């Protein structure tokens, strides 16, 4: 009889990150906490969200059950739930999901977890560069590149982490030596991506949070955010745009 209670900002962060690529994903209530991973219909990006049980103001499961949650209606209802308005999720039945907050109890029906596209096996990626920086400084690097182009270049070496965008009349570069990055392993990496997705990922995160970036050469990029003050871990994996010769 799932009976969880999280803060409003917590539910609003995950539902947004998820529904940011899907409209219905399977949510996994495990012993270690809440899990849920999905790829967009396009098959370009992947999101993996984790909420260990210590982020909830209570997390009561009576067996690890998976539920098919209609992410759109959930996200849509979430725009009511307040930031401080504790929300309690309950699934004491098999057909519906009760969402309680304030004097409102919303009840949306559940989906057959196996009725939704089966999620993607979490990749086993081995990437050269590992950059740890602030999500805000990052979100500002993406916002800037969006005015110059549809794509950007993540360039890593020993002299720091670089993100570059070029237009036919201008260019922009976001550089942070290892000395200004929270962490940096200095590995050499270089992959190009579409600002479109990168800008969409940046929505579920703001300044003040941290971000680890796993970059390789002509490989996808892993964007692991510590959201809601380290209470929610949202990872976005974007496929690269390969330089066609």
């Amino acid at each position: 009889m799932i009976d969880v209670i999280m803060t409003g900002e917590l539910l609003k962060t995950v539902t947004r990150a998820i529904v940011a690529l899907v409209s219905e994903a399977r949510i996994h209530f495990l012993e270690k906490g809440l899990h849920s991973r999905a790829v967009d219909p396009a098959n370009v990006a992947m999101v993996i969200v984790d909420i260990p049980k210590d982020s909830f103001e209570v997390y009561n499961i009576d067996e690890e059950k998976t539920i098919g949650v209609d992410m759109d209606r959930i996200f849509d209802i979430s725009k009511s739930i307040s930031t401080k308005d504790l929300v309690e999720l309950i699934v004491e039945d098999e057909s519906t999901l009760k969402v309680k907050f304030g004097s409102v109890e919303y009840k949306v029906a559940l989906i057959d977890p196996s009725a939704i596209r089966k999620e993607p096996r979490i990749p086993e990626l081995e990437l050269p560069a590992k950059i740890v920086m602030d999500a805000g400084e990052f979100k500002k690097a993406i916002a800037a590149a969006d005015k110059i182009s549809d794509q950007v270049i993540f360039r890593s070496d020993k002299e720091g982490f670089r993100i570059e965008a070029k237009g036919d009349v201008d260019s922009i570069v976001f550089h942070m030596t290892e000395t200004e990055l929270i962490e940096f392993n200095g590995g050499e990496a270089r992959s190009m991506f579409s600002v479109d997705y990168l800008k969409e990922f940046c929505k579920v995160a703001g300044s003040g949070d941290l971000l680890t970036i796993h970059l390789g050469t002509n490989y996808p990029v892993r964007l692991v955010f510590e959201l809601v003050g380290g209470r929610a871990k949202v990872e976005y994996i974007l496929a690269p745009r390969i330089e066609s010769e």
């Binding site: 790829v39 098959n43 370009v44 990006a45 992947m46 993607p120 096996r121 990749p123 990626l125 794509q151 190009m192 579409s194 490989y219 996808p220 994996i237 496929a239 690269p240 745009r241 390969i242 330089e243 066609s244």
Partner: peptide
């Protein structure tokens, strides 16, 4: 030029 790839190649 550049071609957006898919995640299927890496999974």
């Amino acid at each position: 030029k550049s071609t957006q790839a898919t995640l299927e190649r890496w999974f």
